Amino acid sequence: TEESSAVQYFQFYGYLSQQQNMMQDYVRTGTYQRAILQNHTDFKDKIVLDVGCGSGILSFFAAQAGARKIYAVEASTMAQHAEVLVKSNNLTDRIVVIPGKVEEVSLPEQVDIIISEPMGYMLFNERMLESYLHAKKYLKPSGNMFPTIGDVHLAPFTDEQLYMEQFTKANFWYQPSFHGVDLSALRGAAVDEYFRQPVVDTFDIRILMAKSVKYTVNFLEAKEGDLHRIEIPFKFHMLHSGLVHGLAFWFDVAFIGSIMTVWLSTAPTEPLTHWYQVRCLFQSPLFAKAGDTLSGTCLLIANKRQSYDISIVAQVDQTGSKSSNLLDLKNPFFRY
Amino acid sequence: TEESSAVQYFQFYGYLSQQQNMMQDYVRTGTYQRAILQNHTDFKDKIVLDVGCGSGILSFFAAQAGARKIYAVEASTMAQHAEVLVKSNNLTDRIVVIPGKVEEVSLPEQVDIIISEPMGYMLFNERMLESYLHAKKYLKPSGNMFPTIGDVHLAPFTDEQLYMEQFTKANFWYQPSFHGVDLSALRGAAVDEYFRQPVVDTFDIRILMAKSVKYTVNFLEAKEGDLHRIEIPFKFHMLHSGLVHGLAFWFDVAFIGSIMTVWLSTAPTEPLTHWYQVRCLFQSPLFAKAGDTLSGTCLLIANKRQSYDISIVAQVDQTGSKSSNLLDLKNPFFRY
Amino acid sequence: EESSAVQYFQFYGYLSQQQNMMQDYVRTGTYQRAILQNHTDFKDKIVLDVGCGSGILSFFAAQAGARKIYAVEASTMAQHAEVLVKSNNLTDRIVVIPGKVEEVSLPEQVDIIISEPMGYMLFNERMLESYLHAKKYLKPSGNMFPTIGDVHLAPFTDEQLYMEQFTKANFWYQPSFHGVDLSALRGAAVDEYFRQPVVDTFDIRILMAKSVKYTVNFLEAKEGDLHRIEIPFKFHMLHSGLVHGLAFWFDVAFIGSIMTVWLSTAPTEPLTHWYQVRCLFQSPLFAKAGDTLSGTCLLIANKRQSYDISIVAQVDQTGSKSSNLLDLKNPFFRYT
Amino acid sequence: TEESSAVQYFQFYGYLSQQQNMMQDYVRTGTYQRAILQNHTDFKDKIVLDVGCGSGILSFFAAQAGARKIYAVEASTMAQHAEVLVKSNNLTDRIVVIPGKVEEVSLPEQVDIIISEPMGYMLFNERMLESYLHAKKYLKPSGNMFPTIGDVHLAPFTDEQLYMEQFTKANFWYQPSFHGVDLSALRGAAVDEYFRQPVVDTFDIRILMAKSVKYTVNFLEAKEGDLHRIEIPFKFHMLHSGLVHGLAFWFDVAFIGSIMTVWLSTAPTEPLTHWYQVRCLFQSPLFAKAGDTLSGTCLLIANKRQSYDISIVAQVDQTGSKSSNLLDLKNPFFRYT
Numbered sequence A, B: 001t002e003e004s005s006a007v008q009y010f011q012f013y014g015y016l017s018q019q020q021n022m023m024q025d026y027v028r029t030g031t032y033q034r035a036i037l038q039n040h041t042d043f044k045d046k047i048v049l050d051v052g053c054g055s056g057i058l059s060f061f062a063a064q065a066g067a068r069k070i071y072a073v074e075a076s077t078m079a080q081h082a083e084v085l086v087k088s089n090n091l092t093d094r095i096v097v098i099p100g101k102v103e104e105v106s107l108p109e110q111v112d113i114i115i116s117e118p119m120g121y122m123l124f125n126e127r128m129l130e131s132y133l134h135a136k137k138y139l140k141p142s143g144n145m146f147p148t149i150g151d152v153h154l155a156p157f158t159d160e161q162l163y164m165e166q167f168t169k170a171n172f173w174y175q176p177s178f179h180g181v182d183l184s185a186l187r188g189a190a191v192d193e194y195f196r197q198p199v200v201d202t203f204d205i206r207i208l209m210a211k212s213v214k215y216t217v218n219f220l221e222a223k224e225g226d227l228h229r230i231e232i233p234f235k236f237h238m239l240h241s242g243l244v245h246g247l248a249f250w251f252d253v254a255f256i257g258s259i260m261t262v263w264l265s266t267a268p269t270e271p272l273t274h275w276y277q278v279r280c281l282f283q284s285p286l287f288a289k290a291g292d293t294l295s296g297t298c299l300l301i302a303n304k305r306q307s308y309d310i311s312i313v314a315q316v317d318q319t320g321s322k323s324s325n326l327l328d329l330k331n332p333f334f335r336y
Numbered sequence C: 001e002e003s004s005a006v007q008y009f010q011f012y013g014y015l016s017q018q019q020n021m022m023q024d025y026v027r028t029g030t031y032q033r034a035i036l037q038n039h040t041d042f043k044d045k046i047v048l049d050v051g052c053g054s055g056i057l058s059f060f061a062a063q064a065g066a067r068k069i070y071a072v073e074a075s076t077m078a079q080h081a082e083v084l085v086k087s088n089n090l091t092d093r094i095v096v097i098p099g100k101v102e103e104v105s106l107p108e109q110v111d112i113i114i115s116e117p118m119g120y121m122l123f124n125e126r127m128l129e130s131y132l133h134a135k136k137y138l139k140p141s142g143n144m145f146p147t148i149g150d151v152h153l154a155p156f157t158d159e160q161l162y163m164e165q166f167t168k169a170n171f172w173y174q175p176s177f178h179g180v181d182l183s184a185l186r187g188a189a190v191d192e193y194f195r196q197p198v199v200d201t202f203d204i205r206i207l208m209a210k211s212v213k214y215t216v217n218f219l220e221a222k223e224g225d226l227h228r229i230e231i232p233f234k235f236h237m238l239h240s241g242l243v244h245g246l247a248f249w250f251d252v253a254f255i256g257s258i259m260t261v262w263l264s265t266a267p268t269e270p271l272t273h274w275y276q277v278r279c280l281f282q283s284p285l286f287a288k289a290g291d292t293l294s295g296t297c298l299l300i301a302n303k304r305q306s307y308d309i310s311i312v313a314q315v316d317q318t319g320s321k322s323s324n325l326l327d328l329k330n331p332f333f334r335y336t
Numbered sequence D: 001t002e003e004s005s006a007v008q009y010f011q012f013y014g015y016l017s018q019q020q021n022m023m024q025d026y027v028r029t030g031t032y033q034r035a036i037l038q039n040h041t042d043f044k045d046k047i048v049l050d051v052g053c054g055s056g057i058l059s060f061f062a063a064q065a066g067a068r069k070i071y072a073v074e075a076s077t078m079a080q081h082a083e084v085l086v087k088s089n090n091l092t093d094r095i096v097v098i099p100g101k102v103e104e105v106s107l108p109e110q111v112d113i114i115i116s117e118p119m120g121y122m123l124f125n126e127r128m129l130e131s132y133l134h135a136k137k138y139l140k141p142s143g144n145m146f147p148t149i150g151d152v153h154l155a156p157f158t159d160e161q162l163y164m165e166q167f168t169k170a171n172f173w174y175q176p177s178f179h180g181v182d183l184s185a186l187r188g189a190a191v192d193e194y195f196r197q198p199v200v201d202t203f204d205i206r207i208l209m210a211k212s213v214k215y216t217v218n219f220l221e222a223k224e225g226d227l228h229r230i231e232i233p234f235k236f237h238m239l240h241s242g243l244v245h246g247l248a249f250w251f252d253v254a255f256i257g258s259i260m261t262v263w264l265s266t267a268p269t270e271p272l273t274h275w276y277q278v279r280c281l282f283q284s285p286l287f288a289k290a291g292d293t294l295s296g297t298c299l300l301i302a303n304k305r306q307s308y309d310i311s312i313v314a315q316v317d318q319t320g321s322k323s324s325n326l327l328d329l330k331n332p333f334f335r336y337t
């Protein structure tokens, strides 16, 4: 099941329209260019590896900041288009497009710095951070990585409207006489399938019932295998009383340069990006009072479809009110 | 039990506050006075039986119309108060209060006309109509009854907000860990109990999806036993497409006098009364298209709680989509 | 009495009532805290749950480690309780016994009795008597949860609440209501309104003196002690003004081996569905700050599972007195 | 690429949400129920094969019409759910759910009638009509197919905004300094990529410039291989003057029973369905006068991705002006907005 979804993934990224959609996100493109250009000393006369370069934009940023040689690896057919852009911008002596997967190609040389845009939904979808970490085999002993660190933020939320939307969709299968047919036997199954879907969109920050818990991956130290099973303990101190309908996820990445640390944030308090935010709904919400603690674990298991199985166990400590939920990030509901 | 329900019923009607609340309904009181006074020749020098007179207001209307003798039968303690008002209004020679049930008291004389206010929610609640029909044992052959007829109007409606309200209430019992306790096994029962509740309130007529079907009871012709089982067939021609969440009920009564026929209407196209309107919800709504026929039966079976067990079977004939519902008219949801 | 008892148990047969009581977080949360934080009183013990309803308290006792819990319920709700015991897989530890605690058979004396027997003013519905009756199954070292109950009384000033009674009763003070002179009933209407205890909450500023506390020790009290409750009071007025009546609230204490947990319905505490109760004087009494208001509140158990309330109060320094009779079975729910 | 394509396809159809989305389409479900119930004589005490039954709704309709035995074949995981419903509606004696592809499973008995919903975009997308026709090896000689026939309708359209959209979108690349990068060299490629996408949406019928040309497939007569290469000649009698930007496509299917013929239509003159309509743009527009003829061919080549490559050649006969396009139906642009 891994090979087929990998084929579909790279076919999806072979399209210029996807490159345009991602490049038109000005937060992404502008933050990356700021991180690279304001840290020009991390690129001046340096060797760069651009992992999953796509159309090559990050490599062009590296060249703008003064890089001597940039190896831009790309496994999709977009590599060819990148080469076209390298020629038409007269950067053939500085940007070397290397077609293929970063786990299989040969570089002639170790690099001073690795740059990439490997973030997916919840920072981890598409599992490309594993390729980003794998590329560290080419990194000189004290080399740098752009982005350097990644923070996933989790926070309980209340949203009755979203819960009722999904619950009603599931309740379609509560009908006992749909065109004279009893569907009710499948209702449970339907509910399960509907609540396994993470909800990808934005929201007002006032739905957040507690301060976010932060889980940090240091890309300078993380190993690829570390991303196969990600265990995130959490303990929220509730600031508002009400129903917890689930957990909201967003992420920031930090480019820790020798001049400046530049943050790319997809937080709901920041301008919207094409990453949006992700929300895992409980099949049944948990009541809590302000001052209570909501504690548990979010376990992300990498699956062979370049996504994650999400398991959220969360309990209100004061009453012992527990919730266990399973989700699949490969079937997200693009609500917006 | 029947005895205990009757005890509670008459204790409820012993309170002056209930008399005030019913009498402050200007549609009820004003329409009754209009029907009696504009048909004064049906009362001039006549013999009147007031069934369940309460404080006696209808007996006073009959006296204003010139009734020679009015027997005002009341089983609650309110009978005493009626006598006070008879004495303080100097009508001791024309209004005779008779305490007790009309089924058990003895009147000295056959009456020219019976007047009563026997209508409950859906016109049938409290089963007082039976007592009303029973009073015909005292009616002269040329006698009349005010009200003379009663029309029950049914009409399919769409109200997603009401359905969502009741469903959300029932969803409390879907919790797997309410204070660590699994309630979900009762959810079905919960849903049933919530959708057995008739919803007593008013609504905009724009929620009605077909012209009303009318079921008429002729109080002059009807016998008491007829009200033990009431079958109301219906075949609506759907005027709008969408979800039928249930059936709405209201009623009219006609005082068919000699001079004039006067109508008392509780329809949603009419000024609101304390009867409001009554809606019966379906646990699963029925999708219908304009031009379809929604056919079925409403069955009222008299129970020992001075009320009716209601069965409503409806189906969209084009698709065979069917809905069977039970409603306990002894547990209404007053939505205001 | 039977006609009221059957209606009482029919009322308590509905899942909506159980849900409304369970959703009161003060009630359910305080019971769970008291049982769990006194787990040494429950670990491996025999427990009797008097009037278990849906069984929630029995589940709390099982969570604390009870070896066997007998949960007795007289309404049809007992059936649902059984469903919850099977679905939570506690049949070997929780035995649901349908019927009244005075009539069912327990196979074993219990280590501790738990119950939620509190009504309005702590005594309404008379279930405390059943609670005390259950002591026939208590071992000589047995404990009661709740262990004690304090009823608090305090004089209040509310000119507008007093005004409302006459504004409502003055409906009857009309010489031509549709041509009928209603005035002769005005006095009765007034009396009827003043005989209603007023169930709602209020600002603690309306209290004119520190409360007087009357305590029932459930470990020592006998059933017949609750048939006639005499509460003398001598308030030392902290403010000058008119006293329109007495305000009532209550607390109960669970006195466990580890700690004592209080459940309070005081107006200084968060609102519960018990609210607070206010009994007006027919005529207010003027008191200066520093005067003493002395008198007696006599609660007499009646045949409708409630109490007749006789209140006699006087300002000692002036001799002004007021005497008032109320029926707690017909309270006026004023909260909106 | 059949392996990845088909595993993705069946995983897509394993979801109850997709089944519900198809069932809630009242045109689809209602028309199928009408065609089966109003032709009860074709099902009463009959043997029925349901091809790709999904949750089994069509098998339940056939049961409503009195079918003696119904084999419901489903290749996705939805078969499990189908089985559940068969048990929960007390029809295990009459409906047998067979999990697996209709080309690979073994039906013990020859059937009197085959029912299915194999239609995709342009009636041919997802290539399930091939499985529907392959199922005829289980059909009795006098048997029937529900649906019986299928008409694909082509019609020239004018949509200036739609045509200009492609160049507006591709012109993102026609920038000499996008964050300091000259993207211009890719603009042309972008254009090509946009023009290879059939546009799935609806439109007002007034953009249609001529009566549709209809290509009929008769499922009772057609062979599976007939759908590997579909050549649709067209000559349109232009009813309006203007610039033709491409061809619009929709389809109907007809259930031809003993009692009645029932039509399920996805035409733009009919209420919208989840099939919408499909529009393929020419590379360059062609001016045509009303009374001119627009002639050419739409050649559908079945490809390995359970879809079709669409080759379209058109010319205004009275002027000789011509245009063409080659589109990939596996990657349509969902424009419904």
Ligand SMILES: Nc1ncnc2c1ncn2[C@@H]1O[C@H](CSCCNCc2cccc(Br)c2)[C@@H](O)[C@H]1O
Pocket: A009, A010, A013, A014, A022, A025, A028, A051, A052, A053, A054, A073, A074, A075, A076, A078, A100, A101, A102, A103, A117, A118, A119, A120, A121, A128, A131, A273, A274, A275
């Ligand atoms: N092993 C590999 N070797 C070489 N290249 C590889 C490898 N894996 C992947 N790639 C290439 O990197 C690129 C994907 S990462 C972009 C991640 N942002 C997604 C995104 C989601 C939501 C909003 C926004 Br806004 C952006 C593609 O070009 C892909 O083909």
Ligand SMILES: Nc1ncnc2c1ncn2[C@@H]1O[C@H](CSCCNCc2cccc(Br)c2)[C@@H](O)[C@H]1O
Pocket: B010, B013, B022, B025, B028, B051, B052, B053, B054, B073, B074, B075, B076, B078, B100, B101, B102, B103, B117, B118, B119, B120, B121, B126, B128, B131, B273, B274, B275
């Ligand atoms: N067998 C009997 N013999 C003698 N009297 C009897 C007997 N049964 C009953 N009554 C008396 O008739 C009266 C009840 S009918 C009023 C029905 N409208 C209700 C109502 C509902 C919603 C809105 C509005 Br506005 C009014 C009471 O006084 C009652 O004590």
Ligand SMILES: Nc1ncnc2c1ncn2[C@@H]1O[C@H](CSCCNCc2cccc(Br)c2)[C@@H](O)[C@H]1O
Pocket: C009, C012, C020, C021, C024, C027, C050, C051, C052, C053, C072, C073, C074, C075, C077, C099, C100, C101, C102, C116, C117, C118, C119, C120, C127, C130, C272, C273, C274
């Ligand atoms: N002799 C008996 N034997 C067995 N069970 C019995 C017996 N008497 C009663 N019960 C059961 O106990 C339960 C009633 S107590 C709830 C008292 N809170 C009321 C209340 C009022 C205001 C606010 C809030 Br908040 C709660 C019912 O389930 C009832 O059926």
Ligand SMILES: Nc1ncnc2c1ncn2[C@@H]1O[C@H](CSCCNCc2cccc(Br)c2)[C@@H](O)[C@H]1O
Pocket: D010, D013, D021, D022, D025, D028, D051, D052, D053, D054, D073, D074, D075, D076, D078, D100, D101, D102, D103, D117, D118, D119, D120, D121, D128, D131, D273, D274, D275
């Ligand atoms: N060889 C096979 N053997 C057995 N079953 C098979 C086989 N191939 C597929 N199937 C099953 O047939 C079903 C097809 S979906 C109905 C096709 N309309 C789509 C559609 C598109 C736009 C709008 C709307 Br409205 C509906 C799926 O369940 C699929 O799993």
